[PDB]
């Protein structure tokens, strides 16, 4: 469906962002 | 299926200025394990809070703008690409972007240029230096905050004809959708050869190597435009994968896409005259202007506050928007308009800010 194809796109793209966040060490506030 | 998500109101407070709070953002850049921080903006103030156990909301620092007539409408978090230090950009009625060091509450730098109020600020999801501002002057502007340059101005011949109220980058940061008082939603690709080059040139700009000022792109033409979704001002827009969520005062957030049902977002022609409406997330009593909806990082939840203090939440993993509705979050003491909400990066906490300067904390069960 258009739904599952869209959720998969969100899943893969948020994963790319999450992996970039994981490699970062932003100092606390 | 059905929504499973449940929340509990664990705390609330009211800021001493008693003015409407228009914006709230958790800092999603803080690493796993580090404390959960969020900023609120309203009046000429920017306030930072830390979330602790047993619903404690701890006040960290307060920023009071020198201009007592300033009304901050928006904020966005970023980080310094060199030092890893967090940064907060804020803007509002004066049309000035201030970059604040959140650890000291000092204004590090400011950007003048918009002809009027700035309604929204968004940082690029892959590049922390690329800041987008949308304005009452009918234009969007893209800034490179490392070289202090104006990369591009999105407006002009086929740009917005009235205030731009909202904008959002897509997940990978290849395009922006904007919307505003002219009832239109406009797509602006930033992965075009022209824009990628303009971004590369903003980084090459060295002022202690040249006397000439930096030349910004003037992007007069969007990659898609529609006035066929809403019949009034469009005050909030977000990407949902390749689809769009947008709202007017019709007591619905509309899910739609440019072109016909099967059309690829990246194959859409600038002259594309069709749109496909895929669904509506219906709610009530949110017919006043300037009310924003939000999603969590994983885009599994959609939240929106209404004019009487109810907080609607939907599960985006449920295909039918009607079966996607979760238990509305209500508290008998929360009666003022909820302007914006923000989920913590892990979705464990939902903060709501109100017209009466109150802050509401909801913890996920
Ligand atoms: C005294 C008062 C009450 C209100 C409602 N404002 C207000 C807020 C904004 N914002 C803040 C929230 C928001 C949410 C969605 C889209 C754009 C914006 C921009 C703009 C203009 C006005 N204005 O009417 O001057 N000022």
Author numbering:
A (entry chain D): 40 to 68
B (entry chain A): 76 to 440
Authors' text:
To elucidate the binding modes of EED396, EED666, EED709, EED162 and EED210, we determined the crystal structure of EED in complex with each respective compound at high resolution. The crystal structures were solved using a EED-EZH2 peptide (40–68) complex, except for EED396, which was determined using apo-EED. As illustrated by the biochemical results, all five compounds do indeed bind directly in the H3K27me3 pocket. The phenyl moiety of EED666, the furan moiety of EED162, and the methoxyphenyl moieties of EED709 and EED210 all make cation-π stacking interactions with the guanidinium group of the Arg367 side chain, with the characteristic face-to-face orientation. While the central rings of EED666, EED162 and EED396 form π-π stacking interactions with the side-chains of Phe97, Tyr365 and Tyr148, those of EED709 and EED210 are involved in cation- π and Van der Waals contacts. The nitro group of the nitrophenyl moiety and the pyrazole nitrogen of EED666 both interact with Asn146, Tyr148 and Asn194 through a water-mediated hydrogen bonding network. In addition, the tetrahydroisoquinoline moiety of EED666 induces the rearrangement of Tyr365 to make the nitrophenyl moiety interact with Tyr365 and Tyr148 through a cation/ π - π interaction. However, they exhibit significant induced conformational changes for residues Trp364 and Tyr365 (with a movement of the respective side-chain of more than 5Å), moderate changes for residues Arg367, Glu238, and Met256, and minor changes to residues Phe97 and Tyr148. Together, these changes result in the formation of a much deeper pocket as compared to the original aromatic cage found when H3K27me3 peptide is bound.
